[PDB]
């Protein structure tokens, strides 16, 4: 059951294993977000970027357009550079494509509940929405979620009483 040898990557899973332990299948039980930061200090993954990417892919189900707007403090603490950022949407990326694809059709909504919280800037979303990418999920499967992008970066690009 356990890895035996510690690396960055060890403690990312550790931290990420606790997660969806903790929070049970409908995420009902989710560790506050204060003591997910607190897990994240004691595990020392603050400083890893691939943070983003763990958190993306733990926190949230199928009420993940429910869910994605309501961790925003905790948020501006952990993701702390667009490289944050950045592996937040490959989190996102994986948690759609790889096991969770009857969601894809979510990703606008999703992309609507980043942007207008600020979680993940315009640039950000941009280069998900515009580019493949090998980095997170195979070619194949990037082509596929990233495509569901389309009509929020279509509106990004041409955005009394």
């Known amino acids: 059951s356990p890895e035996f040898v510690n690396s960055e990557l060890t403690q ?10 903790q929070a049970g299948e ?29 958190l993306a892919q733990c926190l949230f ?10 961790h925003n403090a905790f948020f501006t603490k952990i993701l702390v550079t667009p490289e944050y950022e950045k592996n937040f949407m490959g989190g996102i990326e994986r948690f ?26 315009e640039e950000e979303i941009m280069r998900f929405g515009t580019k493949s990418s090998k980095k997170f999920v195979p070619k194949e499967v990037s082509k596929k979620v990233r495509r569901a992008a389309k009509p929020f970066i279509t509106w ?3 955005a009394e009483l």
């Open 12 to 21: 990312l899973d550790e931290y990420g294993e606790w997660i969806l332990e």
């Open 96 to 121: 759609l494509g790889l096991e969770h694809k009857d969601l894809i059709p979510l990703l606008p909504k999703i992309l609507v509940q980043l942007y207008n919280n600020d979680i993940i800037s």
């Open 26 to 54: 409908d995420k009902e039980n989710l560790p506050s977000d204060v003591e997910l930061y607190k897990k994240a200090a004691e595990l020392d993954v603050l400083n890893d970027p691939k943070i983003g990417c763990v």
């Open 156 to 158: 990004l690009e041409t």
């Open 61 to 70: 189900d199928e009420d993940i357009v429910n869910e994605i707007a309501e």
